Write a protein that binds this ligand. Sequence first.
Ligand SMILES: COC(=O)[C@@H](CC(C)C)NC(=O)[C@H](C)NC(=O)[C@@H](O)[C@H](N)c1ccc(C)cc1
Ligand SMILES: [Co+2]
Ligand SMILES: [Co+2]
Ligand code: NA
Length: 263
Amino acid sequence: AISIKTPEDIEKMRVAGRLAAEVLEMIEPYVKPGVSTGELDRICNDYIVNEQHAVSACLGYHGYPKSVCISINEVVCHGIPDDAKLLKDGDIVNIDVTVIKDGFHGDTSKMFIVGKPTIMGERLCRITQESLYLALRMVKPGINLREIGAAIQKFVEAEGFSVVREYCGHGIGRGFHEEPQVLHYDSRETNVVLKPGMTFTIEPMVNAGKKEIRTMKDGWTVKTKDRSLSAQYEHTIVVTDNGCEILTLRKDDTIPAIISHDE
Ligand SMILES: COC(=O)[C@@H](CC(C)C)NC(=O)[C@H](C)NC(=O)[C@@H](O)[C@H](N)c1ccc(C)cc1
Ligand SMILES: [Co+2]
Ligand SMILES: [Co+2]
Ligand code: NA
């Protein structure tokens, strides 16, 4: 039950992925010491609705209260935007955006480092991005997803980091979450052979310590069991005839929008 997108659908995904990407570009100047995450969420929502004439896919989804997720330091994912929550020097910060435009979803996140990098935050963010990028470079018709999960996990662990098991990338299109599940580690269960026009996300969560996570008493916030740092990047892609196209590319990405394995 993997959706194959038509060229008209893929074009709608390009628009929606571009808007999601542009939310993350827009917000970047506002990501500063002493800004609250509640404020950042406010800026993002206004932009999505008022300017982009889009909607947040996150708002209301399984009851999620805000328009974007903002996750700091040892928060793994689903960090809830909040006014007592102030950014400060050294923080690593994930903003994860999903927009619906013209029926189609675009889903992307990046890390921002606030004020002065700590060495360890820098390394973790860089390795996590490189883990996404290497997975992106493998995407092409006829490869299996199992191969890709296995490659991400190998790279990350070689750094003495760990891969979060509980959250995975996913098909995306008219549905926020569609088949397949894209696991960022090796599993016998995986057996999806990629085909031109599947669209999905890859979104590895990498912990500097151990892979175990815990959910907080707000019912949303996910943290490392061990309080070590955690980082995540996410891109929405379409499988093309000889590679992939990243639908959520930003100006700060250092990988090409179109990755071609063709002679
Ligand atoms: C184990 O997988 C899950 O728990 C569910 C969470 C439910 C409550 C939405 N799925 C996810 O967390 C997925 C994997 N997350 C994402 O797709 C994020 O990329 C996406 N932007 C997002 C979706 C939904 C929420 C509440 C937050 C972020
Ligand atoms: Co996301
Ligand atoms: Co996602
Ligand atoms: Na984090």
